[PDB]
Amino acid sequence: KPINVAIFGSTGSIGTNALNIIRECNKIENVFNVKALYVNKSVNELYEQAREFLPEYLCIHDKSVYEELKELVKNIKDYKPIILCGDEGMKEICSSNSIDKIVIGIDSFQGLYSTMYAIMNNKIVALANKESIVSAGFFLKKLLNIHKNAKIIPVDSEHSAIFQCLDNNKVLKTKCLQDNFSKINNINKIFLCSSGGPFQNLTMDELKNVTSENALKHPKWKMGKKITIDSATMMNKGLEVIETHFLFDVDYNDIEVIVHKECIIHSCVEFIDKSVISQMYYPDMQIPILYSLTWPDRIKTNLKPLDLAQVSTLTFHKPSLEHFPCIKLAYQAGIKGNFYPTVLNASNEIANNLFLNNKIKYFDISSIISQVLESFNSQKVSENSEDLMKQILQIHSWAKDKATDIYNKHN
Amino acid sequence: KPINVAIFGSTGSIGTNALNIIRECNKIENVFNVKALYVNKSVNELYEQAREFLPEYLCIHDKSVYEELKELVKNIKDYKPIILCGDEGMKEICSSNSIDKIVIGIDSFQGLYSTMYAIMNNKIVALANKESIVSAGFFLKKLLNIHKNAKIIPVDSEHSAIFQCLDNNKVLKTKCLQDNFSKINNINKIFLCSSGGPFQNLTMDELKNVTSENALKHPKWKMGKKITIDSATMMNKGLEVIETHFLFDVDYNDIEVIVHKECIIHSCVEFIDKSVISQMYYPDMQIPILYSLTWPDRIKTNLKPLDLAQVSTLTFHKPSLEHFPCIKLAYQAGIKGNFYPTVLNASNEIANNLFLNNKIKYFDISSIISQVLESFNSQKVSENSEDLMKQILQIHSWAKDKATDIYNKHN
Numbered sequence: 071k072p073i074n075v076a077i078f079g080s081t082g083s084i085g086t087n088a089l090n091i092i093r094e095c096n097k098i099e100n101v102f103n104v105k106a107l108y109v110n111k112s113v114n115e116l117y118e119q120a121r122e123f124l125p126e127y128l129c130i131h132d133k134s135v136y137e138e139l140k141e142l143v144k145n146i147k148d149y150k151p152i153i154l155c156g157d158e159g160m161k162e163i164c165s166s167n168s169i170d171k172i173v174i175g176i177d178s179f180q181g182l183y184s185t186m187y188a189i190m191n192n193k194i195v196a197l198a199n200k201e202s203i204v205s206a207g208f209f210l211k212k213l214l215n216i217h218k219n220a221k222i223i224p225v226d227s228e229h230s231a232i233f234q235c236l237d238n239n240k241v242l243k244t245k246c247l248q249d250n251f252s253k254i255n256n257i258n259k260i261f262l263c264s265s266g267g268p269f270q271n272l273t274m275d276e277l278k279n280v281t282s283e284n285a286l287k288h289p290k291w292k293m294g295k296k297i298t299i300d301s302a303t304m305m306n307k308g309l310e311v312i313e314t315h316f317l318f319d320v321d322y323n324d325i326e327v328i329v330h331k332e333c334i335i336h337s338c339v340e341f342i343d344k345s346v347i348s349q350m351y352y353p354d355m356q357i358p359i360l361y362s363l364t365w366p367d368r369i370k371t372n373l374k375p376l377d378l379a380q381v382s383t384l385t386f387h388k389p390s391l392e393h394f395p396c397i398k399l400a401y402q403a404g405i406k407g408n409f410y411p412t413v414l415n416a417s418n419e420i421a422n423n424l425f426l427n428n429k430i431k432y433f434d435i436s437s438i439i440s441q442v443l444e445s446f447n448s449q450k451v452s453e454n455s456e457d458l459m460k461q462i463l464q465i466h467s468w469a470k471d472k473a474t475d476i477y478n479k480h481n
Numbered sequence: 482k483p484i485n486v487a488i489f490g491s492t493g494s495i496g497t498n499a500l501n502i503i504r505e506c507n508k509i510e511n512v513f514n515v516k517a518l519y520v521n522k523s524v525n526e527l528y529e530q531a532r533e534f535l536p537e538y539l540c541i542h543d544k545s546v547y548e549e550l551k552e553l554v555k556n557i558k559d560y561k562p563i564i565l566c567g568d569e570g571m572k573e574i575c576s577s578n579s580i581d582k583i584v585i586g587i588d589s590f591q592g593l594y595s596t597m598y599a600i601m602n603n604k605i606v607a608l609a610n611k612e613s614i615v616s617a618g619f620f621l622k623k624l625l626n627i628h629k630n631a632k633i634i635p636v637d638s639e640h641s642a643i644f645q646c647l648d649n650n651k652v653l654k655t656k657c658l659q660d661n662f663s664k665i666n667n668i669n670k671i672f673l674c675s676s677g678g679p680f681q682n683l684t685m686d687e688l689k690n691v692t693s694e695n696a697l698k699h700p701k702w703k704m705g706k707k708i709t710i711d712s713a714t715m716m717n718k719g720l721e722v723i724e725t726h727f728l729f730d731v732d733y734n735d736i737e738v739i740v741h742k743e744c745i746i747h748s749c750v751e752f753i754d755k756s757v758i759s760q761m762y763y764p765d766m767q768i769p770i771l772y773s774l775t776w777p778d779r780i781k782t783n784l785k786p787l788d789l790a791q792v793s794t795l796t797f798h799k800p801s802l803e804h805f806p807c808i809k810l811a812y813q814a815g816i817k818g819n820f821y822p823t824v825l826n827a828s829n830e831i832a833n834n835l836f837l838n839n840k841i842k843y844f845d846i847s848s849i850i851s852q853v854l855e856s857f858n859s860q861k862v863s864e865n866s867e868d869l870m871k872q873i874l875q876i877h878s879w880a881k882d883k884a885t886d887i888y889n890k891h892n
């Protein structure tokens with residue numbers, strides 16, 4: 071019973087960690103068939119991936135490097151893949167009966183599009199892109215009720231942890247992003263653990279003057295620039311609060327952010343009897359990715375066993391909302407509901423990039439996001455799926471423009 | 482619709498905690514029917530329980546307080562309980578079609594008798610008495626293979642924690658003590674957490690001088706004397722290693738004792754992918770008892786929610802086997818198998834009591850147990866149940882007598 075997987079965004083962080091753990095697990099026994107790989111324009115890296123995994127399908131988004139892919143791939147002996155291009159290629163791969171599970175390792179707003187078509191083809195969607203859930207949660211909910219066989223399985227590390235803490239006999243009576251998921255799983259409350267980021271111990275006056283270099287340099291854990299900035303402001307965690315709400319139907323007043331600087335306990339689930347279950351390991355994306363592909367089973371790995379005695383000490387504290395106002399904004403937008411999460415995510419995209427590029431200061435990030443949120447007005451939510459997606463796109467675009475306008479008016 | 486339960490050992494620590502949580506769960510809805518209470522001789526406390534819970538059955542092991550009990554219960558208007566005595570009473574209760582689940586809160590080897598009959602009557606046995614498993618593990622496995630609908634559900638805090646950490650989708654396809662339980666549940670390794678007891682930070686020179694008064698006094702968590710002494714020597718953890726092995730079919734080399742002095746993490750399971758799941762709460766027996774009665778579901782309690790930020794710090798270290806040699810003895814007895822665990826438990830019962838009563842020194846505890854284990858000669862294991870039981874009783878008695886002999890020859 072092999073597991074037939076497509077990897078979307080195969081040359082990125084998530085994509086390469088997916089192939090790493092598949093590679094390593096396949097050495098123990100051959101359980102995975104990599105059936106498709108899809109990237110934007112990393113044609114030389116995609117070639118190299120195809121040489122190893124020999125997927126049936128290859129797809130590159132950017133048509134301008136299509137012919138170069140075809141040329142590179144002729145050098146592979148006895149290998150005749152289907153080489154596809156752009157959105158059309160993505161829809162073709164998602165509609166293959168030969169593919170059961172698709173890892174979505176495509177970043178930013180763009181990740182939502184492939185998520186959508188994987189759901190429409192009733193696949194298991196291993197979704198790392200939290201922005202898709204934040205921006206399009208209710209739409210994704212609606213879609214998952216049309217496509218009863220589709221499932222989103224979380225890959226974001228804390229959400230994977232939460233999922234790993236549940237009893238699958240209860241999970242199988244529902245699915246992620248369903249109303250009443252928490253009630254069916256007897257969930258009371260979530261502890262959503264955080265690294266706390268590089269600024270975790272700075273004073274207000276120090277925060278006033280921090281730069282993106284300070285966020286990016288000497289990192290404990292080397293990550294991409296956008297998520298590093300979001301880790302520094304703790305807007306990552308704020309996005310992850312909304313992600314928790316949508317995935318597991320947990321009320322906002324039942325999600326507690328906790329700073330856990332050792333990053334061993336990945337998050338915790340309090341049940342209605344007050345028992346708490348947690349998922350622990352070294353900081354790690356290979357188990358989250360793997361579990362998304364093996365769920366509801368687990369398979370053997372050769373990962374290093376956790377040495378709790380060596381770890382020795384674990385610590386927990388409450389984040390300061392004054393120092394990390396992005397967290398408060400995320401709760402506020404989440405609780406308001408409607409399209410306020412879309413607006414949060416979009417305005418943060420702009421504010422994050424302004425700070426990265428040294429155009430604004432740390433507290434301007436939250437200032438801009440706050441002002442965009444305040445200017446939005448709740449919109450009647452379309453009952454039609456197509457119109458709902460058009461609303462999300464329009465609101466996303468509006469909010470990014472509004473953020474930029476606020477920046478330019480002050481500047 | 483109500484869960485029909487008997488409480489065996491109702492006046493003790495486990496029994497009172499079971500009635501406490503049942504009382505709370507029963508405030509609005511009829512969740513549990515307390516069908517039966519059984520004690521040894523605490524007739525005044527049983528009377529008080531009887532007036533509140535009005536069980537169908539009352540049972541007293543000590544026939545000398547029958548008349549006293551009958552006299553007390555007459556003061557309860559319109560109550561006509563069936564009042565039973567001794568082993569006969571116990572067996573009549575276990576045989577009742579009106580009883581679904583039995584809580585075994587009877588201490589010492591004696592707990593084995595009701596455990597055996599509860600299994601022979603295909604009941605759900607919520608078992609707190611670890612000595613039953615250590616003394617008679619293989620026998621209980623054999624009995625559970627015959628009595629297909631009987632189940633042991635663990636109540637010992639660490640074992641409840643481990644059971645909770647498992648995925649009930651897999652648990653439901655096996656049961657505790659069954660061969661292959663660990664394979665079906667994808668268990669790789671157990672972290673068996675301990676408080677470490679009162680003596681955990683003493684030097685070798687200090688530890689030589691410890692007395693039972695030292696172990697019992699200013700207790701961090703107040704417990705009964707026998708368990709307090711076993712916690713002090715870490716023979717409680719030794720017993721719990723063997724308990725783990727039997728309940729979950731985990732090899733001894735895959736059971737790691739960890740001292741976790743804050744006693745929030747109650748134990749952890751490492752699965753074959755190296756993901757670890759843990760259960761945590763304040764020190765608590767109400768959740769383990771309740772869960773044993775509700776499994777595979779959970780119900781609401783009003784226990785104080787865990788405040789992880791208030792706990793703030795969790796620590797983990799390995800125990801010193803030089804300081805806590807009882808651990809090593811338990812591993813050795815468990816690895817040897819046969820009836821060495823029976824001998825361990827029996828000789829401990831004597832050595833514990835000698836220390837409690839100020840007759841021997843701390844290191845004499847381990848010395849006496851070690852000498853009885855070295856003295857014992859492996860016996861072919863009886864093939865029929867009734868003979869196997871007789872063998873266990875004979876060996877338990879022999880090991881107690883041998884420990885006492887060693888004591889008497891020394892002093």
Ligand SMILES: NC(=O)C1=CN([C@@H]2O[C@H](COP(=O)(O)OP(=O)(O)OC[C@H]3O[C@@H](n4cnc5c(N)ncnc54)[C@H](OP(=O)(O)O)[C@@H]3O)[C@@H](O)[C@H]2O)C=CC1
Nearest residue numbers: 079080081082083084109110111112131175176177198199
């Ligand atoms: N990295 C991590 O550990 C974590 C990431 N996440 C989330 O997962 C998502 C992926 O992040 P990460 O892997 O870090 O991102 P990366 O930037 O490292 O990789 C993104 C991948 O998507 C590809 N891609 C971009 N646009 C398209 C497109 N239109 N069609 C097809 N492929 C496309 C890129 O191709 P190319 O190489 O050709 O540019 C690349 O392979 C993000 O939303 C992130 O927040 C969540 C938890 C942790």
Ligand SMILES: NC(=O)C1=CN([C@@H]2O[C@H](COP(=O)(O)OP(=O)(O)OC[C@H]3O[C@@H](n4cnc5c(N)ncnc54)[C@H](OP(=O)(O)O)[C@@H]3O)[C@@H](O)[C@H]2O)C=CC1
Nearest residue numbers: 490491492493494495520521522523542586587588609610
């Ligand atoms: N207390 C705890 O929190 C924990 C307990 N356990 C285990 O649970 C078991 C019970 O412990 P605990 O509650 O502390 O013990 P207690 O000594 O507090 O209670 C023992 C109970 O058993 C009754 N009893 C004794 N002999 C008989 C008999 N022959 N027939 C019927 N009832 C009898 C006693 O009756 P009477 O009142 O008449 O004497 C009392 O109700 C032990 O094996 C212990 O290790 C494990 C985890 C922790």
Ligand SMILES: O=C(CC[C@@H](c1ccccc1)P(=O)(O)O)N(O)CCc1ccccc1
Nearest residue numbers: 227264265266267291301306333353354355
């Ligand atoms: O959301 C995130 C990245 C940000 C969070 C994080 C940063 C650093 C450590 C752990 C978690 P933060 O809590 O700062 O928002 N993850 O899910 C990735 C976890 C991971 C895995 C392997 C190596 C490093 C990090």
Ligand SMILES: O=C(CC[C@@H](c1ccccc1)P(=O)(O)O)N(O)CCc1ccccc1
Nearest residue numbers: 638675676677678702712717744764765766
């Ligand atoms: O085995 C035991 C008692 C000994 C272990 C213990 C002692 C103290 C705290 C936790 C655990 P130790 O690790 O010292 O052998 N339990 O299962 C009971 C746990 C519990 C619950 C509520 C209040 C107190 C204690």
Ligand SMILES: [Ca+2]
Nearest residue numbers: 545546548549
């Ligand atoms: Ca009498």
Ligand SMILES: [Ca+2]
Nearest residue numbers: 645646647648
């Ligand atoms: Ca569980």
Ligand SMILES: [Ca+2]
Nearest residue numbers: 669732734735
């Ligand atoms: Ca092993």
Ligand SMILES: [Mn+2]
Nearest residue numbers: 226227228310
């Ligand atoms: Mn995350």
Ligand SMILES: [Mn+2]
Nearest residue numbers: 637638639721
């Ligand atoms: Mn215990």
